Tab-separated table of C-alpha atoms and ligand atoms in Angstrom:
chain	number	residue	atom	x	y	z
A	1	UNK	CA	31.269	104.953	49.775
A	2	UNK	CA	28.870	102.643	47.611
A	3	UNK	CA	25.003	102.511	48.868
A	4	UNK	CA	25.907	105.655	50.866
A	5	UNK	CA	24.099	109.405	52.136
A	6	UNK	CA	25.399	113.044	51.547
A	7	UNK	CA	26.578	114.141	54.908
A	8	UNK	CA	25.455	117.062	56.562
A	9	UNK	CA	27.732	119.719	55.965
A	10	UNK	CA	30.492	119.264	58.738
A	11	UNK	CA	28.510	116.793	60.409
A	12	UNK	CA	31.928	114.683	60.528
A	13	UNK	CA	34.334	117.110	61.718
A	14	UNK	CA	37.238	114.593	62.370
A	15	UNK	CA	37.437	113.751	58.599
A	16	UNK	CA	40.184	114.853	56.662
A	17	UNK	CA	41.154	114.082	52.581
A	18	UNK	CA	44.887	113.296	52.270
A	19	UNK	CA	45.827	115.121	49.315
A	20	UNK	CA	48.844	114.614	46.377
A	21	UNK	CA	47.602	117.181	43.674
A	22	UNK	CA	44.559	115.054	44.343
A	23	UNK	CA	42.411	113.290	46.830
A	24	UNK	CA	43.845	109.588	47.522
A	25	UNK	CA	42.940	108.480	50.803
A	26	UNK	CA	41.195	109.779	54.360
A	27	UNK	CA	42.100	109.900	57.716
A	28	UNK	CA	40.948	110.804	61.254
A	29	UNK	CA	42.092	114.185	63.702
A	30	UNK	CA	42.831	112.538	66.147
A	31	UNK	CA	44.563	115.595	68.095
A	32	UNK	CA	45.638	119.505	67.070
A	33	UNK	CA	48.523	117.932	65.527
A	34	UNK	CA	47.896	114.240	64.932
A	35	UNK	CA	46.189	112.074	62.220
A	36	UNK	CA	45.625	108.664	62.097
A	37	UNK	CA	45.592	107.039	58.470
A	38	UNK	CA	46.117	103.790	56.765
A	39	UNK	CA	50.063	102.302	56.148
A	40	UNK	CA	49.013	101.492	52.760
A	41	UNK	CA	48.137	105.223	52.037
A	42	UNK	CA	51.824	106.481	52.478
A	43	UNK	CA	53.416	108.886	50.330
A	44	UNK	CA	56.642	110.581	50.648
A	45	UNK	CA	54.615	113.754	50.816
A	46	UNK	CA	50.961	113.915	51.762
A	47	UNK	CA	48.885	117.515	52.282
A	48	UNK	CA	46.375	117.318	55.037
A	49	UNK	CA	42.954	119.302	53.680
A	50	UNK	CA	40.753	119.434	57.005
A	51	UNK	CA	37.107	120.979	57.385
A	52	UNK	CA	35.911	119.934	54.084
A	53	UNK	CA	32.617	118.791	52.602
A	54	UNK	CA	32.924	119.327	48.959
A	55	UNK	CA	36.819	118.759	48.016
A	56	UNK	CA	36.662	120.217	44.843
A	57	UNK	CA	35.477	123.573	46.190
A	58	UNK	CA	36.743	126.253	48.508
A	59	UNK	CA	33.858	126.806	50.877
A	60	UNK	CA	35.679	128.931	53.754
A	61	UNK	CA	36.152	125.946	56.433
A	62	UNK	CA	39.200	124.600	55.195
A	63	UNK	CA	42.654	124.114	56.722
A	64	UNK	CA	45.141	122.819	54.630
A	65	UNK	CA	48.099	121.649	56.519
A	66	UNK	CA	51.386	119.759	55.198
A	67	UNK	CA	52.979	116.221	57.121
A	68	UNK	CA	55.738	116.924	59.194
A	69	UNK	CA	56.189	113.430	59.919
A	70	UNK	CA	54.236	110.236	58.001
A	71	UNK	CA	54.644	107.279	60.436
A	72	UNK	CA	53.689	103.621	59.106
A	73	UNK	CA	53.165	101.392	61.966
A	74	UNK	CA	56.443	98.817	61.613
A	75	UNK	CA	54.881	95.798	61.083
A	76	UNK	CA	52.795	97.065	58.485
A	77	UNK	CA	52.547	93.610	56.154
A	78	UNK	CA	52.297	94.989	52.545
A	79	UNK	CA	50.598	91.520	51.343
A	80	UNK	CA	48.251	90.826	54.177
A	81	UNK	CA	47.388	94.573	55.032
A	82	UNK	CA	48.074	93.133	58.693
A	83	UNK	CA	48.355	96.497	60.546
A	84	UNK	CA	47.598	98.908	58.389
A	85	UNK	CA	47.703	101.624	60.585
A	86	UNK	CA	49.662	105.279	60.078
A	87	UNK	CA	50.285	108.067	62.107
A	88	UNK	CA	50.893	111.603	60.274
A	89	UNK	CA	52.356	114.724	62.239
A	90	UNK	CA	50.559	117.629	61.094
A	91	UNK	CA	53.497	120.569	60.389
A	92	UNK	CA	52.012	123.086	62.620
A	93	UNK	CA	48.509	122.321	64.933
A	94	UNK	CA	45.586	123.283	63.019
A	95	UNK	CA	42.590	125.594	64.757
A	96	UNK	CA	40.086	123.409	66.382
A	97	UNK	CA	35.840	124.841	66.132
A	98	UNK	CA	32.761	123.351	64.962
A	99	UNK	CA	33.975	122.181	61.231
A	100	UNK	CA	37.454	120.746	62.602
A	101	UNK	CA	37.570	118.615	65.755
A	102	UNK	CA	38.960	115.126	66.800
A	103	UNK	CA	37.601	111.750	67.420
A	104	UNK	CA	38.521	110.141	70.658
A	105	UNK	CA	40.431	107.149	70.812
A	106	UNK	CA	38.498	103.611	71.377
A	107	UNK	CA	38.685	102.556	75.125
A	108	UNK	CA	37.507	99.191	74.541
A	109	UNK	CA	37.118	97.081	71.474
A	110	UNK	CA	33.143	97.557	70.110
A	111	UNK	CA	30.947	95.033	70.121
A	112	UNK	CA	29.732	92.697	67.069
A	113	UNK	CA	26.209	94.162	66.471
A	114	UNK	CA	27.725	98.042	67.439
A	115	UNK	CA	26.228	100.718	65.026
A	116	UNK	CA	28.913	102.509	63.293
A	117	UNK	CA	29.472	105.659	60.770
A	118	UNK	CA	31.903	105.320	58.160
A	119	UNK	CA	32.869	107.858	55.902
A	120	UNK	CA	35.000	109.166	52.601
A	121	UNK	CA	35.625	110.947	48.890
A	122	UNK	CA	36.318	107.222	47.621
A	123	UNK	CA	34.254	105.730	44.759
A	124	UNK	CA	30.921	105.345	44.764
A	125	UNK	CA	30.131	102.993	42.570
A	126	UNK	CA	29.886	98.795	42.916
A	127	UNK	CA	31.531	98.793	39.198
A	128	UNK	CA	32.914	101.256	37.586
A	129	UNK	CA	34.458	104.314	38.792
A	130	UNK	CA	32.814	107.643	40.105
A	131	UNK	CA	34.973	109.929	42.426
A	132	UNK	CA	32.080	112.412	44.267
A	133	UNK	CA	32.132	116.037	45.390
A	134	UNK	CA	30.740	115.596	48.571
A	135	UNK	CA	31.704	113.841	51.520
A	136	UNK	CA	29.631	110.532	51.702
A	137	UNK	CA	28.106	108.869	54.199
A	138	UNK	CA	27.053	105.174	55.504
A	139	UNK	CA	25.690	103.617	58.706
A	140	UNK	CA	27.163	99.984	59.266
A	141	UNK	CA	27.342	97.362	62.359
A	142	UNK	CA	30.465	95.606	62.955
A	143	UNK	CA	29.985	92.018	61.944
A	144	UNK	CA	30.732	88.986	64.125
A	145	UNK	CA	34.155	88.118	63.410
A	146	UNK	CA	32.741	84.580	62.425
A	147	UNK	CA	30.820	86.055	59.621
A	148	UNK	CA	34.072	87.944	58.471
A	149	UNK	CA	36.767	85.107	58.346
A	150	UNK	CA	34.138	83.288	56.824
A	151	UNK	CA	33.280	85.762	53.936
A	152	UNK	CA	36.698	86.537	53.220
A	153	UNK	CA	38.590	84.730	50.173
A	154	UNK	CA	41.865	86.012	52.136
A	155	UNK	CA	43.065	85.807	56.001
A	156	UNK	CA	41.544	88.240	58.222
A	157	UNK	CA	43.735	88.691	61.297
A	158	UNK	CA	42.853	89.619	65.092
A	159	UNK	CA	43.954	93.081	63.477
A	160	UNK	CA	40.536	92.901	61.299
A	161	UNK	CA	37.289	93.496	61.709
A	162	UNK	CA	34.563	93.495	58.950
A	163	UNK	CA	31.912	96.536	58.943
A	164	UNK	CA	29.048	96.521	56.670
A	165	UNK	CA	26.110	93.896	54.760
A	166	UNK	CA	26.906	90.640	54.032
A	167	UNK	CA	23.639	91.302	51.420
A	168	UNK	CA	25.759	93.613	49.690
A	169	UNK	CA	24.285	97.442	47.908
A	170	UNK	CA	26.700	99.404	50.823
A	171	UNK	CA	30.363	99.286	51.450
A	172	UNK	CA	33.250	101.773	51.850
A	173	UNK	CA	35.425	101.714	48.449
A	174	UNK	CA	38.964	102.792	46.618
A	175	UNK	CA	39.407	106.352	47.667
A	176	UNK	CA	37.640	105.949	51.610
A	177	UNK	CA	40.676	104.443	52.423
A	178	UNK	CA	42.478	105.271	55.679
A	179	UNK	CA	39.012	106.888	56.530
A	180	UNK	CA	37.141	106.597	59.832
A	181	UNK	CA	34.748	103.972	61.645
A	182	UNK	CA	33.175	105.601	64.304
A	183	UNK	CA	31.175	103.782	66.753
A	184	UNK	CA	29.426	105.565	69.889
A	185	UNK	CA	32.040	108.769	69.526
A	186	UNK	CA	34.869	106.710	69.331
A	187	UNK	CA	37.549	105.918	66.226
A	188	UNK	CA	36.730	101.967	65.955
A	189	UNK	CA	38.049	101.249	62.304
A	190	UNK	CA	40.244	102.246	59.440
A	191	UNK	CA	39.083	101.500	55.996
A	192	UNK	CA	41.614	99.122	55.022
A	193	UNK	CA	40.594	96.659	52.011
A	194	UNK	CA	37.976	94.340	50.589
A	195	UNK	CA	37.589	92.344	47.337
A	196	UNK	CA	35.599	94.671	45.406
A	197	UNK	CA	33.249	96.940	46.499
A	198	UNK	CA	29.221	96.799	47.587
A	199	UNK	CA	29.451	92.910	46.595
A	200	UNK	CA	27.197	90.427	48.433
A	201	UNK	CA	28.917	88.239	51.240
A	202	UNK	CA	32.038	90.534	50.854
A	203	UNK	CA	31.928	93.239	53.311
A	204	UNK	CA	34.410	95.542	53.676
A	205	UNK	CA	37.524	94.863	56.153
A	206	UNK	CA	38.893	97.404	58.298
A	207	UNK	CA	42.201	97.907	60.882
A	208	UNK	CA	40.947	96.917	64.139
A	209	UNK	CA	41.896	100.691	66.217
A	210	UNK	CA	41.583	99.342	69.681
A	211	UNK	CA	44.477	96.920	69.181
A	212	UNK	CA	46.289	99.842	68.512
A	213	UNK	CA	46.157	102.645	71.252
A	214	UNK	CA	49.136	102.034	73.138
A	215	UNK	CA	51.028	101.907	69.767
A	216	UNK	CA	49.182	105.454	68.891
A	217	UNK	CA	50.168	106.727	72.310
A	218	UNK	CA	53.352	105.854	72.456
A	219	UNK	CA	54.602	106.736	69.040
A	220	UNK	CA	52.318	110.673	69.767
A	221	UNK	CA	54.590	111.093	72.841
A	222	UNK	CA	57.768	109.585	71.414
A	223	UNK	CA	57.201	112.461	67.942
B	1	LIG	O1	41.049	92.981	46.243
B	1	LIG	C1	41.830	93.942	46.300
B	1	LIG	C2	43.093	93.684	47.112
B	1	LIG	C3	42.898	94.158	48.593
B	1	LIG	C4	44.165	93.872	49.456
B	1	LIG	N1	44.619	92.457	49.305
B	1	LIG	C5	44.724	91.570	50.419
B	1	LIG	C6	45.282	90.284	50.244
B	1	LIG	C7	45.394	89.423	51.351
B	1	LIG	N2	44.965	89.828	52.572
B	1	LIG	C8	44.430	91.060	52.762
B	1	LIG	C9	44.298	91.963	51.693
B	1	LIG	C10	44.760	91.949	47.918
B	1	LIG	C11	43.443	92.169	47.144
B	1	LIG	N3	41.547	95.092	45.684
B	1	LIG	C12	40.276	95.235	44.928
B	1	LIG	C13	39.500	96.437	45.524
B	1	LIG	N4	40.364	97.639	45.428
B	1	LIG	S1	39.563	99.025	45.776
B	1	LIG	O2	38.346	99.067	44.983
B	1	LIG	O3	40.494	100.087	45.530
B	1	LIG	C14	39.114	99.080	47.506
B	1	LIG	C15	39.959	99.731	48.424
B	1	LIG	C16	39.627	99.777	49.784
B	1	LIG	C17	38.450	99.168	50.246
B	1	LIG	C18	38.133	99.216	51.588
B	1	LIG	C19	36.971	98.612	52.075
B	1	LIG	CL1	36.659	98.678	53.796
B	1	LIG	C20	36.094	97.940	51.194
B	1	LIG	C21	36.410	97.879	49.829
B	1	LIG	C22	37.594	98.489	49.348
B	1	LIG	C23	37.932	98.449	47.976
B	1	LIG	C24	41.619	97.507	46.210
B	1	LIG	C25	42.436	96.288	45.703
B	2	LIG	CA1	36.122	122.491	49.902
C-alpha cells in the first residue's frame, strides 16, 4: 500500500497473508473455512497466516493454517486479469475471536463515490521496492467506472472496478494483491492489477466481488 496508514493492531481482522516461505499475496476470511483470493495469486501450495499485524513477528494472535483446496474461478483470463477471483479451502476451520473474523459478502454492487478500506503487506513504495512489517492501511472511494475505462491504457471489464486517486500519492501495490476492499462491512474488491503503483490518472483496478457471489456460493457448497 503506497500513500498508506499503520493499522491498528487487528483492526482488520478478515485479513490474511498467503504465505510460500514468504508473504506473496492477501486474501479475505470469508468463513471458518473459506478464503477468498486473487486467480493470479495461485500456487500449488499456499499457507494461510491469519490474525497478523506484523508478519515478520510472532505476536501470539496467529493461526497458521495450510489450503486444502486452491480454487481459481474457470474463466480466470491470464492476459486480461478478467475474473481474477480464487477461492482457498482452509485444511481444518480456524478459531474465530476478536483478531480473526470474516467479512460478509457484498449484497449489492457499491456505489461510485462509496468510501472504502483497502489493505496489505505489498510494497509501499511508488518506485522502488520496500516490503513493510506492518499491515498497511488506505481509505479510497470507488471511482465512476467512466473515470476508470478512461484512465486505463488496457480494457477494464464489467468485472473491474477502479478504487483510489486519479491525483495519484495512494494506491494498493505488488504484494496487496488478492487483498480486501471493504466498503460499509462488506468485501467489495480484490486487489487485482494496475500499471504501476501511486501514479497520477492510474488508479488501481480491482475484481468487481458482487459479480461474483453466486459463483462464491456455489463453489463453498459444492467443496
Ligand atoms: O502493469 C502491470 C501488468 C498488470 C496486469 N496486466 C493487464 C493487461 C491487460 N489487462 C489487464 C491487466 C499487464 C500489465 N504490472 C506492473 C505493476 N505490477 S505490480 O507493481 O506488481 C502491482 C500489482 C498489483 C497491483 C494492484 C493494484 Cl489494485 C494497483 C497496483 C498494482 C501493482 C504488476 C504488473
Ligand atoms: Ca506476526
Amino acid at each position: 500500500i503506497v500513500g498508506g496508514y499503520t493499522c491498528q493492531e487487528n483492526s482488520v481482522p478478515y485479513q490474511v497473508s498467503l504465505n510460500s516461505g514468504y508473504h506473496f499475496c492477501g486474501g479475505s476470511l470469508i468463513n471458518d473455512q473459506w478464503v477468498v483470493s486473487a486467480a493470479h495469486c495461485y500456487k500449488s501450495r499456499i499457507q494461510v497466516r491469519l490474525g497478523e499485524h506484523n508478519i515478520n513477528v510472532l505476536e501470539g494472535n496467529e493461526q497458521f493454517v495450510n489450503a486444502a483446496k486452491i480454487i481459481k474461478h474457470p474463466n480466470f483470463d491470464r492476459e486480461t486479469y478478467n475474473n481474477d477471483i480464487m477461492l482457498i479451502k482452509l485444511s481444518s476451520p480456524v478459531k474465530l475471536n476478536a483478531r480473526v473474523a470474516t467479512v460478509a459478502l457484498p449484497s449489492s454492487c457499491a456505489p461510485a463515490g462509496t468510501q472504502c478500506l483497502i489493505s496489505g503487506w505489498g510494497n509501499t513504495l511508488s518506485s522502488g521496492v520496500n516490503e513493510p512489517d506492518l499491515l498497511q492501511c488506505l481509505d479510497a472511494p470507488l471511482l465512476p467506472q467512466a473515470d476508470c475505462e478512461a484512465s486505463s491504457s488496457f480494457i477494464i471489464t464489467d468485472n473491474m472496478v477502479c478504487v483510489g486517486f486519479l491525483e495519484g500519492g495512494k494506491d494498493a501495490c505488488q504484494g496487496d494483491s488478492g487483498g480486501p476492499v471493504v466498503c460499509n462491512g462488506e468485501l467489495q474488491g480484490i486487489v487485482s492489477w494496475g500499471y504501476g503503483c501511486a501514479l497520477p490518472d492510474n488508479p488501481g483496478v480491482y475484481t468487481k466481488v458482487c459479480n461474483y457471489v453466486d459463483w462464491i456460493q456455489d463453489t463453498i457448497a459444492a467443496n
